[PDB]
Design an enzyme around this catalytic site. Structure first.
Site, PDB file in Angstrom:
ATOM      1  N   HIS A   1       0.871  -1.166   0.000  1.00  0.00           N
ATOM      2  CA  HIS A   1       0.000   0.000   0.000  1.00  0.00           C
ATOM      3  C   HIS A   1       0.911   1.219   0.000  1.00  0.00           C
ATOM      4  O   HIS A   1       2.120   1.053  -0.156  1.00  0.00           O
ATOM      5  CB  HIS A   1      -1.019  -0.051   1.105  1.00  0.00           C
ATOM      6  CG  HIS A   1      -0.432  -0.108   2.470  1.00  0.00           C
ATOM      7  ND1 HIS A   1      -0.003  -1.274   3.080  1.00  0.00           N
ATOM      8  CD2 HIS A   1      -0.237   0.890   3.367  1.00  0.00           C
ATOM      9  CE1 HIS A   1       0.421  -0.968   4.280  1.00  0.00           C
ATOM     10  NE2 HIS A   1       0.299   0.328   4.488  1.00  0.00           N
TER      11      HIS A   1
ATOM     12  N   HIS B   1       1.934   3.490   2.385  1.00  0.00           N
ATOM     13  CA  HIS B   1       2.736   3.893   3.523  1.00  0.00           C
ATOM     14  C   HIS B   1       4.224   3.769   3.404  1.00  0.00           C
ATOM     15  O   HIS B   1       4.725   3.018   2.563  1.00  0.00           O
ATOM     16  CB  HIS B   1       2.202   3.240   4.807  1.00  0.00           C
ATOM     17  CG  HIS B   1       0.895   3.833   5.206  1.00  0.00           C
ATOM     18  ND1 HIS B   1       0.005   3.236   6.063  1.00  0.00           N
ATOM     19  CD2 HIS B   1       0.302   4.975   4.795  1.00  0.00           C
ATOM     20  CE1 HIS B   1      -1.081   3.975   6.167  1.00  0.00           C
ATOM     21  NE2 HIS B   1      -0.925   5.034   5.402  1.00  0.00           N
TER      22      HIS B   1
ATOM     23  N   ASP C   1       6.406   2.347   5.226  1.00  0.00           N
ATOM     24  CA  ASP C   1       6.973   1.051   5.498  1.00  0.00           C
ATOM     25  C   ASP C   1       6.685   0.088   4.334  1.00  0.00           C
ATOM     26  O   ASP C   1       6.876  -1.147   4.452  1.00  0.00           O
ATOM     27  CB  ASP C   1       6.479   0.485   6.858  1.00  0.00           C
ATOM     28  CG  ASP C   1       4.963   0.389   6.956  1.00  0.00           C
ATOM     29  OD1 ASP C   1       4.279   1.288   6.428  1.00  0.00           O
ATOM     30  OD2 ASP C   1       4.441  -0.582   7.587  1.00  0.00           O
TER      31      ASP C   1
ATOM     32  N   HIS D   1      -6.268  -2.464   6.424  1.00  0.00           N
ATOM     33  CA  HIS D   1      -5.405  -1.562   7.150  1.00  0.00           C
ATOM     34  C   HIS D   1      -5.269  -0.219   6.406  1.00  0.00           C
ATOM     35  O   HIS D   1      -5.129   0.850   7.044  1.00  0.00           O
ATOM     36  CB  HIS D   1      -4.054  -2.195   7.272  1.00  0.00           C
ATOM     37  CG  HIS D   1      -2.968  -1.200   7.534  1.00  0.00           C
ATOM     38  ND1 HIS D   1      -2.816  -0.568   8.747  1.00  0.00           N
ATOM     39  CD2 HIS D   1      -2.021  -0.689   6.723  1.00  0.00           C
ATOM     40  CE1 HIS D   1      -1.820   0.285   8.672  1.00  0.00           C
ATOM     41  NE2 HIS D   1      -1.326   0.232   7.450  1.00  0.00           N
TER      42      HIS D   1
ATOM     43  N   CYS E   1       0.326  -5.217   6.107  1.00  0.00           N
ATOM     44  CA  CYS E   1      -0.267  -4.603   7.293  1.00  0.00           C
ATOM     45  C   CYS E   1      -1.721  -4.911   7.612  1.00  0.00           C
ATOM     46  O   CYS E   1      -2.201  -4.686   8.739  1.00  0.00           O
ATOM     47  CB  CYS E   1       0.003  -3.096   7.274  1.00  0.00           C
ATOM     48  SG  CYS E   1       1.761  -2.921   7.013  1.00  0.00           S
TER      49      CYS E   1
ATOM     50  N   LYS F   1      -2.062  -9.002  11.304  1.00  0.00           N
ATOM     51  CA  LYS F   1      -1.294  -8.792  12.533  1.00  0.00           C
ATOM     52  C   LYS F   1      -0.624 -10.109  13.011  1.00  0.00           C
ATOM     53  O   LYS F   1      -1.093 -11.180  12.721  1.00  0.00           O
ATOM     54  CB  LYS F   1      -2.220  -8.180  13.578  1.00  0.00           C
ATOM     55  CG  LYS F   1      -2.495  -6.724  13.202  1.00  0.00           C
ATOM     56  CD  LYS F   1      -3.631  -6.150  13.823  1.00  0.00           C
ATOM     57  CE  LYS F   1      -3.789  -4.762  13.257  1.00  0.00           C
ATOM     58  NZ  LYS F   1      -2.474  -4.093  12.954  1.00  0.00           N
TER      59      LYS F   1
ATOM     60  N   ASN G   1      -2.675   1.972  13.710  1.00  0.00           N
ATOM     61  CA  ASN G   1      -3.096   3.121  12.892  1.00  0.00           C
ATOM     62  C   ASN G   1      -4.274   2.873  11.952  1.00  0.00           C
ATOM     63  O   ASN G   1      -4.167   2.134  10.985  1.00  0.00           O
ATOM     64  CB  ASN G   1      -1.894   3.593  12.051  1.00  0.00           C
ATOM     65  CG  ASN G   1      -2.227   4.743  11.151  1.00  0.00           C
ATOM     66  OD1 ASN G   1      -2.874   5.690  11.576  1.00  0.00           O
ATOM     67  ND2 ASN G   1      -1.774   4.675   9.885  1.00  0.00           N
TER      68      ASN G   1
ATOM     69  N   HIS H   1       4.086  -6.438  10.399  1.00  0.00           N
ATOM     70  CA  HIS H   1       4.975  -6.272  11.535  1.00  0.00           C
ATOM     71  C   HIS H   1       4.861  -7.514  12.388  1.00  0.00           C
ATOM     72  O   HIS H   1       3.782  -8.053  12.600  1.00  0.00           O
ATOM     73  CB  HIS H   1       4.426  -5.115  12.360  1.00  0.00           C
ATOM     74  CG  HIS H   1       4.427  -3.823  11.618  1.00  0.00           C
ATOM     75  ND1 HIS H   1       5.589  -3.146  11.336  1.00  0.00           N
ATOM     76  CD2 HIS H   1       3.437  -3.137  11.009  1.00  0.00           C
ATOM     77  CE1 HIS H   1       5.324  -2.091  10.594  1.00  0.00           C
ATOM     78  NE2 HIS H   1       4.023  -2.069  10.371  1.00  0.00           N
TER      79      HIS H   1
END
Ligand code: NA
Length: 222
Positions: free
Chosen positions: A73, A75, A77, A136, A155, A158, A167, A197
């Protein structure tokens, strides 16, 4: 995992697939897929420098030249080191929604855009990208490696030790759980399931995540 430079470490899940953890003090995930001394990079670390180190170790230690890039996406990261990749002349593919959000934000723009599914051939090995709905990030996709039974969910997934939604500034919260359903329904034979993550695991991450999202939806409707 093998420690390396720039707050980065790596784990091999198969002969051709490796997953990395880049620390920036938050840790973020990505994948390195290799076929014929060519590599696909799934998400970049948060900036060019960490990305450069990673790209160098793949060449040096993995003897593979990074030729492909796919972000999860928009972001940092995911596309934080895109600028540098583009300087290396790396080809990239992303959900069209990622490309548009990236243009509009003046952020490095992935090259080719798809809207539903895309199968990128890394010199012969298939990298199946699917946009299954917002989660996310409204633009989040997942990459599936059919030959390896490895899913990088990004993301929207999880790890098994997470307890929080994180977020949701760019999330489609109510779509998040339906998208996780499609994922579970779509990749039931996944051996490894890599999250944005945290530790990778198996398909159980999909349900655990759906639990967190539903707990969040439940907690803000009381
Ligand atoms: Na990432």
């Amino acid at each position: 995992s093998v420690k390396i430079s720039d707050d980065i470490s790596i784990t091999q899940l198969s002969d051709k697939v490796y997953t990395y953890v880049s620390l920036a003090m938050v840790p973020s995930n990505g994948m390195i897929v290799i076929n014929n001394h060519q590599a696909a990079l799934l998400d970049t670390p948060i900036n060019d420098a960490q990305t450069e180190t990673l790209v160098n170790w793949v060449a040096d230690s993995l003897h593979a030249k990074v030729t492909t890039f796919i972000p999860n996406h928009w972001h940092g990261d995911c596309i934080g080191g895109l600028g540098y990749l583009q300087k290396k002349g790396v080809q990239s593919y992303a959900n069209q929604m990622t490309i548009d959000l990236a243009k509009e934000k003046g952020l490095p723009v992935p090259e080719h855009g798809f809207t539903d599914s895309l199968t990128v051939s890394l010199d012969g090995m298939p990298l199946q990208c699917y946009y299954l709905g917002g989660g996310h990030a409204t633009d989040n996709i997942v990459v599936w490696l059919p030959t390896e039974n490895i899913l990088f969910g990004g993301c929207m997934l999880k790890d098994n030790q997470a307890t929080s939604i994180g977020n949701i500034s760019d999330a489609d919260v109510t779509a998040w759980p339906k998208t996780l359903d499609k994922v579970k329904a779509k990749f039931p034979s996944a051996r490894y399931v890599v999250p944005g993550h945290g530790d990778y695991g198996g398909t159980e991450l999909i349900e655990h995540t759906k639990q967190i999202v539903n707990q969040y939806i439940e907690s803000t409707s009381k």
